[PDB]
Amino acid sequence: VYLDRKLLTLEDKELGSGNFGTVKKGYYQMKKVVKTVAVKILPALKDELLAEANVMQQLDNPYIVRMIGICEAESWMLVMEMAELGPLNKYLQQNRHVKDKNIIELVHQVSMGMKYLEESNFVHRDLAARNVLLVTQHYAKISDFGLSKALRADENYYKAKWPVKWYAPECINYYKFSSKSDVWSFGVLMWEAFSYGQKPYRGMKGSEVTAMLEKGERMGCPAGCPREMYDLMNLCWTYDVENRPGFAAVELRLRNYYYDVVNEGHH
Ligand SMILES: COc1ccc(Nc2nc(N3CC[C@H](NC(=O)c4ccc(C(=O)O)cc4)C3)nc3scnc23)cc1OC
């Protein structure tokens, strides 16, 4: 898990920054091959990066960004496998030609990764289109585990600036974060994807979003988004935690609809 700084070569330019730290492109000499990497570079900030690394170490799924390891040099560094195409929202903003079938493919991949995360009893707590990274146009991975929590053996939730527009009502009202709250976030992520990376709740303050949702109102159907996918969004935005679907149910719906669209394409 502990990497050798002299086997790591970093670029001068920066890729971008998340909630904390800064990410640069790099190259790491493995056992034989050289691997292209994305490297998060920086007392509280040190522990946050190590907690993020601790979460990633425990995860093993094709639809989740893999950690290569950590290194304490100029600063603490978190070395991850590179996803070359970057954040999903930014990609779709630059590529409006991307077909509806392709969007379904990508959000289904996210649902598979989240089904695994749910099974593993980890809550992501920051699921948004910005935190889905593209390996290719047809391969998405979940990233940015800086706010993620391993659930206690005896509880199905974690009790806690917040990304309010992605948060379920129980997160706001009770500070409770579960796989179900991740499902709510996933609904917002779906809306973002089908809106080609547009920000949700445009022009609204966090408090106004909370007020809107309390009234039972939800964001409208994005232009060109299939009704079946908008229906799934709304299901993810079920106010009641118990009645809201888990990721097993969400993944199955997406899987089945994706196959329907693949079938229509062949006809
Ligand atoms: C195409 O450019 C790219 C190519 C590869 C990558 N690749 C990668 N970037 C990042 N970071 C994690 C932290 C950085 N966040 C933002 O830059 C950002 C973006 C958008 C919003 C918003 O809309 O709110 C917020 C934050 C990006 N992490 C990993 S892990 C494996 N690959 C990457 C990134 C590119 O862009 C950063």
UniProtKB/Swiss-Prot annotation:
ATP binds at residues 15-23, 40. Ubiquitinated by CBLB after BCR activation; which promotes proteasomal degradation. The modification Phosphotyrosine is found at residues 2, 116, 139, 157-158, 174, 257-259. Changing residue 178 to Y: In IMD82; constitutively active protein tyrosine kinase activity. The modification Phosphothreonine is found at residues 22, 210. Widely expressed in hematopoietic cells (at protein level). Expressed in neutrophils (at protein level). Within the B-cell compartment, expressed from pro- and pre-B cells to plasma cells. The active site is at residue 126. The modification Phosphoserine is found at residues 17, 207. It is found in: Cell membrane; Cytoplasm, Cytosol. Residues 9-259 form the Protein kinase domain. Belongs to the protein kinase superfamily. Tyr protein kinase family. SYK/ZAP-70 subfamily. Interacts with LYN; phosphorylates SYK. Interacts with RHOH (phosphorylated); regulates mast cells activation. Interacts with NFAM1 (phosphorylated); probably involved in BCR signaling. Interacts with VAV1 (via SH2 domain); phosphorylates VAV1 upon BCR activation. Interacts with GAB2 (phosphorylated); probably involved in IgE Fc receptor signaling. Interacts (via its SH2 domains) with CD79A (via its phosphorylated ITAM domain); the interaction stimulates SYK autophosphorylation and activation. Interacts with FCRL3. The SH2 domains mediate the interaction of SYK with the phosphorylated ITAM domains of transmembrane proteins. Some proteins like CLEC1B have a partial ITAM domain (also called hemITAM) containing a single YxxL motif. The interaction with SYK requires CLEC1B homodimerization. Non-receptor tyrosine kinase which mediates signal transduction downstream of a variety of transmembrane receptors including classical immunoreceptors like the B-cell receptor (BCR). Regulates several biological processes including innate and adaptive immunity, cell adhesion, osteoclast maturation, platelet activation and vascular development. Assembles into signaling complexes with activated receptors at the plasma membrane via interaction between its SH2 domains and the receptor tyrosine-phosphorylated ITAM domains. It is linked to Immunodeficiency 82 with systemic inflammation: An autosomal dominant immunologic disorder with onset in early childhood. It is characterized by recurrent infections with various organisms, and multi-organ inflammation that manifests as colitis, hepatitis, arthritis and dermatitis. Patients have a propensity for the development of lymphoma, usually in adulthood. Disease severity is variable. This is Tyrosine-protein kinase SYK. The chain holds residues 363 to 635 of 635 of the full protein.
